[PDB]
Amino acid sequence: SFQTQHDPRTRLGATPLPGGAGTRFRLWTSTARTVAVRVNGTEHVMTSLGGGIYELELPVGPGARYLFVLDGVPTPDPYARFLPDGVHGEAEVVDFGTFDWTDADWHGIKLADCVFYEVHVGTFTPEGTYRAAAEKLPYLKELGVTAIQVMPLAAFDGQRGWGYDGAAFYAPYAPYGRPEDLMALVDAAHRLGLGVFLDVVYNHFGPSGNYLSSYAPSYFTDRFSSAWGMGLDYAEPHMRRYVTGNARMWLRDYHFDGLRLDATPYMTDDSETHILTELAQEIHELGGTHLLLAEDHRNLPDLVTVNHLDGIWTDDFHHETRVTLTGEQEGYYAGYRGGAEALAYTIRRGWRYEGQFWAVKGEEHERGHPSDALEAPNFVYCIQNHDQIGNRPLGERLHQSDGVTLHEYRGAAALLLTLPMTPLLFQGQEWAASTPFQFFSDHAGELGQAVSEGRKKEFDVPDPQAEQTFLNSKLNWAEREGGEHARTLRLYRDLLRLRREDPVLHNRQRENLTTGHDGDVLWVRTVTGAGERVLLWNLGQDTRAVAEVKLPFTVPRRLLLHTEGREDLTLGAGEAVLVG
Ligand SMILES: [Mg+2]
């Protein structure tokens, strides 16, 4: 009974016609008086249909280059499916029917079965391409992760970037590869049984390459704005459809298994049906098993229970863990005490802030809502992600912060990867990578200069516009072969296999999970019909024997995994053990 708003017949942009008849070009403009399409250098006047809709059909095929001409001004297509020359250039006509998919026996992945592995295509490999990423898939499969989480792919200006400056949401960023290269990466992942998720940005457009207002200023509103751009007007149906058509393209046409929606608190909409709800309806209409996740700091269960999203990146856990290990207190970290009792509480509640006052200076308000409705998989936990690394002045990883030992780092992994919540890892985390993940960009002219100036002011700090900042963020695949990188990787492999194989850790019910502390020792207990597991993590700087930890139940006897491989039930400083 929900009916999609989308029909291929009326799709905006350039869409191949059936029967080899060519391509249908369509646009919406509220303000242009003359409207043409320029195809391979030749200008053709478009037909006015009313409602500001203009259309033309021509016998050109996939590969043809085009843009629109509005009152004589050549303007890129916001609906471009590929931009080989970047965001200020001609689009290419793409035919999604030509790729030979081999993934008919893949049927998606459930959230409760996800262990996400966050990839930035530009830094993940030396080449920085989909094709090179695809060659690392067997390594990821064997590692034991189950879903790749790809940072945004929408085209942005410059030769590198995180992806949050995406401006042409439908056009995969050309330096990473052509559309068929992205398709090949997803097909390969599926043939190995890995899911693939995409980070999409529906709260703002980047600062170069967004020509929507040239067509219709009413895509946007001055009613509100984000930190990152003018407000997207979700009261305007064409704006709603820009994002819901984009979501449907990634899932249907690229075979992604789900989307991660960036910064959902800033998708402001006062409409009767919120855009988040309509996104869920539109993706569900595809008749698959695709998932939607929200990156949302509000601790708002309604994203799941009302908007019908599948889960939420819920960072109170991350923050609590980092403050436990470092004691830091700048910015949002001032919201957390850290320590074993604090971490026991945040896990017990899923998130910490359920309506209590958030006292962080400049941000004060009553934050969050009761978490009771949410089940364990609905919470996506991490100890590292692109932001929690890259937002730091030097982009350092958790094991690289002052005062953090590799033992502590390995204990944190054990906690994350034995919890029933849905875990996410950042690329290279699993080998305790030596490289930072720094903020980098490559904007032109004055915008580029302002990025460099802005970064300098907000916090020596690496210049985001320098090539070296990008290169310094590249993964070094050699280093995992040896030393402590290899030892950390063996632990991650061991944790990921237990997560997959242990019949008690299969639990995904908060009803079966309890937590507590004794001094600086955290305990996390799971009890199901299959048995009992307890993770104990010594967050002190002394040694603690498991036998002397005071617990309100009888500790299990059998050692399943010790993060430092010890034979006896004793925890050196920062170490963890799983018993059963
Ligand atoms: Mg074929």
Curated annotation (Swiss-Prot):
GO MF terms, alphabetically ordered: 4-alpha-D-(1->4)-alpha-D-glucanotrehalose trehalohydrolase activity
Alphabetical keyword list: Carbohydrate metabolism, Cytoplasm, Glycosidase, Hydrolase
Chain positions recorded as substrate binding sites: 260-265, 315-319, 363, 386-391
SUPFAM superfamilies: (Trans)glycosidases, E set domains, Glycosyl hydrolase domain
Record-level GO cellular component terms: cytoplasm
Single Gene Ontology BP annotation: trehalose biosynthetic process
Active-site annotation: D262 (nucleophile), E295 (proton donor)
Residue ranges, annotated region (Disordered): 1-21
Pfam families associated with the record: Alpha-amylase, CBM_48, DUF3459
Site (Transition state stabilizer): D387
Annotated EC: 3.2.1.141
Pathway where this protein functions: Glycan biosynthesis; trehalose biosynthesis
This protein's record includes keyword Cytoplasm: yes
Keyword Cytoplasm: yes
Catalytic activity: hydrolysis of (1->4)-alpha-D-glucosidic linkage in 4-alpha-D-[(1->4)-alpha-D-glucanosyl]n trehalose to yield trehalose and (1->4)-alpha-D-glucan
Subcellular location: Cytoplasm
Top-level taxon of the source organism: Bacteria
Transmembrane portions of the chain: none
UniProt main location, coarse: cytoplasm
Assembly behavior: Monomer.
Assigned protein family: Belongs to the glycosyl hydrolase 13 family.
NCBIfam families xrefs: trehalose_TreZ
PANTHER family xrefs: 1,4-ALPHA-GLUCAN-BRANCHING ENZYME, MALTO-OLIGOSYLTREHALOSE TREHALOHYDROLASE
Protein name: Malto-oligosyltrehalose trehalohydrolase
Gene: treZ
